[PDB]
């Protein structure tokens, strides 16, 4: 859970400041057989520990789906581009 916290904090704290190499996060649901590209929601990560769980640690996360993981990135798309593109 500490490593999860540190990973989320590396993705979130230096997201608006500095620079992060990745543009998005890949979320894999092997159990549901579904895949999506996700970004941290506005609600964001929420960790809590409670009386009747003295040894455990509970996490609550919300995400927003950028799109299907099978499709390619907007910036990595190639148009038809038949013939010369540059008017010399």
């Amino acid at each position: 859970m500490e490593e999860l916290q540190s990973r989320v904090s590396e993705y979130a704290m230096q997201g608006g400041s500095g620079n992060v190499s990745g543009s998005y996060l890949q979320f894999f649901n092997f159990t549901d057989d579904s895949y999506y590209k996700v970004h941290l929601a506005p609600q964001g990560l929420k960790i809590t520990r409670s009386k009747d769980e003295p040894l455990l640690f509970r996490y609550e996360i919300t995400l927003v789906v950028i799109g299907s993981l099978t499709e390619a990135d907007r910036s990595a798309v190639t148009t038809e581009e038949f013939g010369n593109v540059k008017p010399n």
């Binding site: 159990t31 549901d32 009747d52 769980e53 003295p54 040894l55 455990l56």
Partner: protein, 70 residues
């Protein structure tokens, strides 16, 4: 058969000591200790994948015949 050779504990071979003194004329002492052990379940699989321990719920009851004093 004999005390010096039996394999089992009995009411006659045990003494209950409280604050350094033997309890007189008790009838039974019984102790329950429960860890609140609970299994951790999971979506997609019906069975739990480990147990964990919650609260040390520990108790002893003493039942005794009333000594005339003390």
């Amino acid at each position: 058969a004999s005390e010096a050779k039996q394999t089992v504990h009995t009411g006659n071979t045990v003494l209950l000591m409280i604050k350094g003194k033997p309890v007189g004329r008790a009838q039974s002492a019984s102790g329950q200790r429960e860890y609140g052990t609970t299994g951790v379940y999971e979506i997609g699989s019906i069975m739990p994948q480990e147990h964990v321990y919650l609260r040390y719920e520990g108790t002893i009851t003493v039942e005794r015949l009333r000594m005339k004093k003390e």
